[PDB]
Amino acid sequence: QLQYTPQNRSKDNGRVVVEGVGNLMHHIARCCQPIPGDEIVGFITQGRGISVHRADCEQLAELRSHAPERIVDAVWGE
RNA sequence: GGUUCUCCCCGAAAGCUAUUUAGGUAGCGCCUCGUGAAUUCAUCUCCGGGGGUAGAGCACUGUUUCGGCAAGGGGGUCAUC
Secondary structure (H helix, E strand, O other): OOOOOOOOOOOOOOOOOHHHOOOOOOOEOOOOOOOOEOEOOEEEOOOOOEEEOOOOOHHHHHHOOOOOOOEEOOOOOO
16 A cells, blocks of 8 residues: 655766766666665666666676677766 | 974075066076986186286376476566657
């Protein structure tokens, strides 16, 4: 009965700062549920902007098997 | 319900079928007596047989667990026309 505020803060910006840039259309993945753990690794998607597909994950590595240029680092900050 | 003298020989059935039949009856099965014929009949060993039961098996009809490969659908990844 109790079933976006947690992602309204990402919609309120901050968090991810890929290569030192702020306010990006980032969005956490799924197969991997990244949290500020093994940091993370970003990935540019056609639409949806940056996909934070966690650091070290198969599907991320698959993308590492396709277009490496799309691949980007990742951080957290606060 | 009961059915009164005596000895002798053999000696059943409580089954099938039908029955406004199912505790009755009839045909037949088994009884007895009489007559008449096949070494006809019974056991046995040898011989020629069909069987699908026990048992066993899982090719088939089903059922069952496990391991394998893996359709194909599910959830996600880039995609999402």
